[PDB]
Amino acid sequence: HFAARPKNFGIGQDVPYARDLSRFMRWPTFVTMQRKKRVLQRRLKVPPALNQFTKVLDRASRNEALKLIKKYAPETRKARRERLQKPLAVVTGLQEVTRAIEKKQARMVVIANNVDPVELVLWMPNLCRANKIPYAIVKDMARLGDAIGRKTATCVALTDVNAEDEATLKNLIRSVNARFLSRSDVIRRQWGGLQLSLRSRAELRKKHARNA
């Protein structure tokens, strides 16, 4: 005595099932504001100095660079205390990295692309280009911090490497220069932003079709 009893979910008809209301719900204020900020930064016209932080290094090269930095990560408190009872590393920290760039000690610089007051690193590519230091802009300060052993990191500089990794460093410098140091005129020229929404774009396309 088993049979189907289908339900009608048209206007009128049967009381419907619980629908998902995520897109039309009233969210908390901080959720709303943090989404609208991204929308605004897409819609407005972005000057080149700020826009240069959107074009980042490719995923494969970023993985290789972070592997090298992790290999040369600095010491921990336990390691330093176990030492000094009787090494080569990367340079971390804004002040030390800036000093290494202002001298010629740095051989490459990696800069995170999502620092919160952007004025902390807005000027860094221009300085690395005024000197002849190869540099790249990568995806996450959280990933840089994971590489060096901290929570986050704004920038990292490599000064000296071992002969086991000299060839890797040379290839990395070449691939990084392909994207950042050699395209400096386009970088200085290119504006950004000015994206319509999908809704607006579809409306424009439909209007052109109807008027043609």
Partner 1 sequence: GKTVLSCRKGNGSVYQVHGHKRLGPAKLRILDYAERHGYMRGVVKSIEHEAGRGAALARVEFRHPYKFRRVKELMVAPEGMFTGQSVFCGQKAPLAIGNVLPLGQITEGCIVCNVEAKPGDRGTLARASGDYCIIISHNHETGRTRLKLPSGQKKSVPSTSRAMIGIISGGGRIEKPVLKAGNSFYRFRGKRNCWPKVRGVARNPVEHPHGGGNHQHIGHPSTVSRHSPPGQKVGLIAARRTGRIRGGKAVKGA
Partner 2 sequence: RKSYTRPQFRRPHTYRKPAMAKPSNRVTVESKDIAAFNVIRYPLTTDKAMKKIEENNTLTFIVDSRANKTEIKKAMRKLYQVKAVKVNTLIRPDGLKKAYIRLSAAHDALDTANKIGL
202: number of CA atoms within 13 Å, CB side? 3
Tell me the window of 8-16, 79-87, 119-127, 129-137 that interacts with partner 1 (CB under 8 A): 8-16
Rg (alpha carbons) of the chain, rounded to whole number: 25
Binding mask 89-128 for RNA (x = CB under 7 A): -------------------------x--------------
Contact residue for RNA among 3, 4, 15, 25 (CB under 7 A): 25
- Per DSSP bridges, beta strands 135-138 and 108-112 are parallel
Q: Which long-range contacts (CB under 8 A, 24 or more apart) does 33-38 make?
A: none
CB under 5 to 8 A by kind: which of partner 2, partner 1, RNA, none does 86 bind? Answer: none
| Closest approach of RNA to the CB of residue 195, in Å | 6
Closest-CA residue to 115 (of 83, 78, 76, 142): 142
Using CB under 8 A, which residues numbered 11 to 50 contact partner 2? 18-22, 24-28
- The DSSP-derived string for 128-152 is HHHTT--EEEES-HHHHHHHHTSS-
Determine if 198 is a binding residue for RNA (CB under 7 A): yes
Contact residue for partner 1 among 12, 28, 87, 117 (CB under 8 A): 12
CB under 5 to 8 A by kind: which of RNA, partner 1, partner 2, none does 142 bind? Answer: RNA
